[PDB]
Design a binder for this molecule. Structure first.
Ligand code: NA
Ligand code: NA
Ligand code: NA
Ligand code: NA
Ligand code: NA
Ligand code: NA
Lengths: 248, 248, 248, 248, 248, 248
């Protein structure tokens, strides 16, 4: 008849790291699933008389610089070039912002197929609003190809031995602020340090994913060649990271 | 026929500390009752073919980091993991914000069953938005497991002999500001000292509760092991408190 | 046929201090009448099978710390304690803010029966949002029991010989700013000096009342014992007043 | 057939100071007429079984401190005293703010019958929100009875020989800022110099009126006794004016 | 079939100063026509049994100080003087602000018949919100009669040999800022330099007009007598202009 | 049955600069097409009994200074001159702002036929809100005719050997800020450096166009004569650019 003994009785519960961590990761909700997208895009591309991969490549390259919403479909140019996009949009039913998980957005297209994106990204790194040169100005050392796109963040794992991934998360973070700086409407008085709270949560959400095993992430990171098999971190990542670590 | 004599006559009323204090504590309203929750959750869990304790554990671990509202049910991840939560939500009828006392919120789930929460909290203390490391940066001395969660505040009693609890209230307060700092939308110019007025009232409301006798609170605090039977305060609590006391 | 001679003719009107002062005090409107409240509360309490005085005591003690509006009837606690209040509310028909003069608000309950309130106030002075200790920090000298509550202000008369009451009005004013400081939503940049204009008008309205003769006010003030029969002002009132007088 | 010759032809128009000045003064619109008020108030007071002068005196004394709008009819006091005002209000049909010229406002009551107002004003000068003492603090020299009320401004003429009136306008202006300071909702950062533009136009409108001949204004000003027959300005007016002249 | 050759072919177009300048001046739109006003006002005045010139004089003198909108028809004065204006308003159908070109506003009345306005302006220059004295304070040298009113600006031509008119435009500009300063609602932090962009466009629009030949403008400017036949600029205009030129 | 292998498999995609660059340029949307305009304007002008070129010249000269929207059709001038524009507007169906790509705006008229615009621009360069003189004040060296209009930006190619075009983009940019400065409603605290983000995207969109081959752009730039056949950059462009490069 007494609530108090059970209420206090919870105390002596046996707690194990692994069970709350294992459950707490798969609690990270349902906002964006990579795996669903590949199935639906594959079905759409197969059914339609066009190659999904060829189309997707165009969609991603469009994504990096053009932004998430293409519905405006207007920005100072001749008609036939933009025309091809419409075919793709109709079958995909892309929607502006984030209406739903099942709804596909181009940034999800980049994220789910991020290795192809890093492959494309190299030549358009300068092409992006953040030039390779402005970025050389920000950090003296030569820039990491792969760590550019904010969606790229999902692959790297913070839980890797020696915590190298942690550094990456910070190191990769700074591009974001500058990219935020370009897309964010107000910049003049804003501080790089504090703004981190916005976009930080999706970034960490990206860090932990059930989609890719650790081996897969390792394969990408060695594939760019930035990290050796001995797992020694590239000088560029940590050295770029010092600016943030100092400035916080 | 004269209002004045009675009006002045109230003056010579015999006043005793104990009667106004005893009545004034049970006046603290009906916003949130721990005891109601245990009865309704027990009934729901028993009636449904699932274990209330096992479910509740998941609900709390979800609560600490995920925030109070789960209805958005969306944040960059694969479907099956989030799926289990829905079953729980339907029977519980959880509602966003604070609509009603009888309505259950997950933070009330943590609060009513706070000892289980402290038991879970240890490994996820780093996992929370405030890392164990950032917190080591804020206070040099090693951190108190139990005093982390803002809902944890309810157990400690300020009225204990030697007023140790008072210190705790201040000492525990600082985590709150930082956690507020993360969840609060605007941080840049805000001051830690002044912001105390928000959340202070529920914190003090937490300090005084009819739910737990003093012995019960003592059992939790000795159970963590932070305080001895001689009731000597851990160095960590007061030493962490000095930062606030100085900075106010 | 000429407007000008009469218009100028008003000039030589015989003016006496006493007649404009006597009329101008009873012009101070009808926002809040103490006397009406005692009659209606007495009728309600007599008609209902409960003691009005016993109930009222609870209502006032609730008033000092809980604020004027109880309709939310919710703040983190168990059900049976708050339950008793409802009975009282139904018969009283209390309304939030200031809708009408006849409508009773709890602060009017405190004001009309302020001597009982000073009698209760002593032990809960620390209990109020402004602690006895913070208040010792603000003023080095030991604090006056009676002069705490902002509603207490009505008793004291500024028109008393030697103008001691004037000092009190200033001296009592500072608690208000701090209490305002707690309840006022924005505090950070606000100045204690300038904010005086808000709440000053009801405070002065309180100073002058037809409800109590001077003898009655004298009885309360000597009853607390703060002022002797020789009418020497307590050191605490004036010494506390110096902070305001300096800071303005 | 040419517009240009006539358009240029206007140039050689014979211009005389007196005709444009004489016409431009009676152009000053129809916002507030003193003369209409005396006729309608006289009719109302005569028709009703009450003395208009006795009532009006109360209405003005109420006006100086209570503000223009009495419709709220509520401010912390007992019922019978405020009750008498209603009778007056019904026959007068007073309206809040400035709805119409024919509509009477209490400040118009003060203005049209301003000599009676100066006669009343002396004892309530301290009583007003600006105390005689605060005003002694602002200006070291002893204060002018008549020049207090902002509505008083209408009598004085700037066009008088030696321009003494001009000084008065400036000298009288400073009370206004302080009174504005009390009634104006925001004071903290506002500057006394710049705020002059608000209320300046009605003040100058007051300076020039067809209602009173110069002799009438002279009669009031000598009647207070502040100015001699030799028309020597009181030391108080100019000496008080130096603060404004310096501070601008 | 190629768009490019014609598109590039436009390049070798023969361009002459006179043809684009001549066309670009008569492109300056249809917001306000002086000539239309004289025809309609002449018809209205002739048809009605009143003299248009006599009426217009009153309308302009009213315009300089009273502002553009007379519809409020209310500002602290006796009835018969304002009464005459109504007759004029009905036939003219004056409208507040700028609704239409055909609609007449009093400032257009001043502008179209600006020489009469300069003739009236002399005695009321002090009468205007900017006193002759404050203006002596701003500029040490004696002030130009004609260059006061902002509507006066239309006559002067910047294109005159030696560019004297240019100086005038700057020199005349400063009165505007001060007049703006009086009518503009917010003054405290505003800068005289930057505010120029507002009202600058109508001012330049005024500088260039098809209404008056250069000879006509010359006739006005020599008629005031400020400029000799040798076209030597008055010391007052340029010397007043130095303040602006320095301060920018 | 596994999503992961294909997802990782995208990595080893063969990436070539030319194919993503070639596709990414014709992705730049459909906001504004030069080529469509020439066809529709040609049809309209041919069908109507007026010369499209003669009309267009007027429309452009109107465009440079008058702004994009002519619908207000009102700004302080006589009727017949503005009248001719209406005929043109009806057939063209010009619309304010940017409603549609097919909709023609006058700035598109300038852009598509920009060589004619540079031909007109020379004499009206001073005529524009930014005077030739203020511009001499900003940059000591003599100003480039062609690089003035913001719409002029489309011709120059950044991809030219030695990157001279890049300099131009920066060098030409500064006029824009000043022109923005005039048309932009708020200027006082704004910074030239940061404001670049607005209008930068259409400027770069202008830099890359499928409309003109490189030879065509070369023809314009040598035609103005600012750049020799040896492709040596004019001193004016780079020397003007130093101010921006320093100030950023
Ligand atoms: Na085509
Ligand atoms: Na599945
Ligand atoms: Na119960
Ligand atoms: Na009664
Ligand atoms: Na009359
Ligand atoms: Na005509």
């Amino acid at each position: 008849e007494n609530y108090r003994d059970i209420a206090l009785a919870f105390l002596d519960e046996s707690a194990d790291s692994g069970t709350i961590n294992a459950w707490v990761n798969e609690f990270a909700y349902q906002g964006f699933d990579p795996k669903r997208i590949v199935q639906l895009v594959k079905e759409r591309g197969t059914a339609k008389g066009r190659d999904w991969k060829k189309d997707v490549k165009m969609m991603i390259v469009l994504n990096l610089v053009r932004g998430n919403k293409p519905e405006a479909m207007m920005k100072k140019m001749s008609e036939k070039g933009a025309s091809i996009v419409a075919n793709l949009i109709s079958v995909y039913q892309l929607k502006e912002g984030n209406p739903g998980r099942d709804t596909i957005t181009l940034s999800r297209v980049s994220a789910a197929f991020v290795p192809w994106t890093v492959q494309a990204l190299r030549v358009l790194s300068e092409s992006l609003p953040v030039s390779g040169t402005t970025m050389d100005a920000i950090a003296g050392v030569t820039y990491p190809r792969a760590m550019m796109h904010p969606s790229f963040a999902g692959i790297i794992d913070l839980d890797l031995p020696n915590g190298a991934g942690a550094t990456i998360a910070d190191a990769h973070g700074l591009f974001m602020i500058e990219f935020s700086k370009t897309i964010n409407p107000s910049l003049r008085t804003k501080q790089a340090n504090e703004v981190a709270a916005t976009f930080e949560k999706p970034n960490m959400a990206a860090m932990s994913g059930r989609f890719f095993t650790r081996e897969d992430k390792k394969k990408l990171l060695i594939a760019v060649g930035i990290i050796d098999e001995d797992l020694v971190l590239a000088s560029a990542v940590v050295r770029s990271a010092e600016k943030y670590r100092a400035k916080v």
